[PDB]
Write an enzyme that holds these catalytic residues in place. Sequence first.
Site, PDB file in Angstrom:
ATOM      1  N   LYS A 212       1.068  65.123 -46.517  1.00 23.25           N
ATOM      2  CA  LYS A 212       1.787  66.254 -47.076  1.00 23.25           C
ATOM      3  C   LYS A 212       1.050  67.564 -47.035  1.00 23.25           C
ATOM      4  CE  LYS A 212       5.553  63.643 -49.023  1.00 23.25           C
ATOM      5  NZ  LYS A 212       6.877  63.425 -49.863  1.00 23.25           N
ATOM      6  N   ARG A 246       4.344  54.887 -49.609  1.00 25.28           N
ATOM      7  CA  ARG A 246       4.846  55.387 -48.236  1.00 25.28           C
ATOM      8  C   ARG A 246       3.986  56.058 -47.332  1.00 25.28           C
ATOM      9  NH1 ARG A 246       7.698  59.458 -46.088  1.00 25.28           N
ATOM     10  NH2 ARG A 246       9.308  59.051 -44.528  1.00 25.28           N
TER      11      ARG A 246
END
Lengths: 266, 266
Positions: A212, A246
């Site tokens: 991210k 995840r």
Amino acid sequence: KWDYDLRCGEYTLNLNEKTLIMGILNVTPDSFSDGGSYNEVDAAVRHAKEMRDEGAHIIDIGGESVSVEEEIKRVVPMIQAVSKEVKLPISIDTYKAEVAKQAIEAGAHIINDIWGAKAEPKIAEVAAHYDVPIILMHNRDNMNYRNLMADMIADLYDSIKIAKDAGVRDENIILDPGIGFAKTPEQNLEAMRNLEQLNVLGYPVLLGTSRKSFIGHVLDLPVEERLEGTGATVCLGIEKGCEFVRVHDVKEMSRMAKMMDAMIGK
Amino acid sequence: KWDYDLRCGEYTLNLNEKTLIMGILNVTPDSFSDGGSYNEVDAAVRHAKEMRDEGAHIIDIGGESVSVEEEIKRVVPMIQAVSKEVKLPISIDTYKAEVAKQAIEAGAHIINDIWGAKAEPKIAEVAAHYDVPIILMHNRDNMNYRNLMADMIADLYDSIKIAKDAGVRDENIILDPGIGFAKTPEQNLEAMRNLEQLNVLGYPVLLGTSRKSFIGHVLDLPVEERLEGTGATVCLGIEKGCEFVRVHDVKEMSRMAKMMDAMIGK
Ligand SMILES: Nc1nc2ncc(COP(=O)(O)OP(=O)(O)O)nc2c(=O)[nH]1
Ligand SMILES: Nc1nc2ncc(COP(=O)(O)OP(=O)(O)O)nc2c(=O)[nH]1
């Protein structure tokens, strides 16, 4: 420490032996098609297979990164193919009730809602009906926090009450701090730094930090050079009590999770 | 949090801004030579240079992985070449007083003793004289522990009293749990799991787990497939308060350290 397992139809996930790895499925859609076509689904299946071989315990499948009827035609064929060809629980990455419903009829085992049942409360009704685990992610339409962590936990509670009011059982509730959503870079770091606070709510926590942008902001590296940064966040997540991560890079993170587990005594 | 910096002659290491990376120098010796020859020293210099570019803050240099006079002829030329060509503090990986002495005359800035001044107490006298930081690593000739952590800390204290009795100043003392020494695989994990206990002694801690066999034991992978395992140990080390990590894979670990630092707020 967890006095139940995560029941997922034909599959059962133990929450005490190991950090569970949710592998993020590639879902490059074919231009020229509605969904269902051979190149998309085959590449999706081959990727699921890879991740299963690399240590993934869940395959997470999305339809948007767009029209509900469109989203279902993309995602349903994938769930059907992957669930027949790959012996692993599938989660459906949607905040839409109808999408969640079809995805489960199609074979999906777990709902993954980035809006924590706030975008479409009926999704909790769906979850309650099929009796499936649902991930309630922290999310909101603004970054105006008084106290980041206090507010996240409040916000998470608002998701839990919606899930419970619709009949969702505690055992089917997973929480997620929603790193990289409704948060400045510095707020993302602050949440990582205080993630253990989520544990007081009494539910398993999934952490999703893979590649991210807040890792980029710290390291000044683009999306494809974020593996060491992601790994750090996974490690710190696991030291702070996360039950799942995840991730895109399943092989690498699997190994880091496995070493963390041995160290912390999971 | 640390109210002094680590003084190293021409270089100064801040202990508060960041986890400091000690890069392990390759020192493949030429068969056919006493030491000093061009291929060994050049490959050593080129490697130091690499590590400096990849984020290392210290270059650690050994003479054995063998005869004291032999060990000095290997290591001295390397220290001389690296210290002239690479603007970074050098530590000398020895437990021998004479080796430590020549290494410092040759340009070395920090002593790195895997026997924590117990193999050759005069090494502390050397350290005291040149007024240099010395790393006291936990080590012993057996694995018969009553309580692993309690005994390590005791053992570390025995190293500190030797250092201090010889005139070593507190500011020049660094401790190291000696992971991978005198410890079963399960004891190595237990030490990792409790590393924060070392902090009560009041000294900066260096952690050295790079590629070591206990990662292999957990992951069932050989030495060259241990990067994710090492990374996990670095991450957990930094969450537990380590000031330095000693590593082979400087680029990768540098990045993981940098992300951990941002997360934990260092
Ligand atoms: N439960 C959960 N679901 C999520 N779905 C999408 C993304 C981010 O999506 P994006 O960066 O668009 O792509 P990718 O899905 O590859 O992360 N993050 C989460 C997350 O952190 N937790
Ligand atoms: N201070 C300190 N010094 C050390 N020196 C050697 C090794 C292990 O040596 P070896 O595995 O033979 O090779 P390498 O030096 O590449 O680790 N570990 C440490 C350590 O953990 N701390």
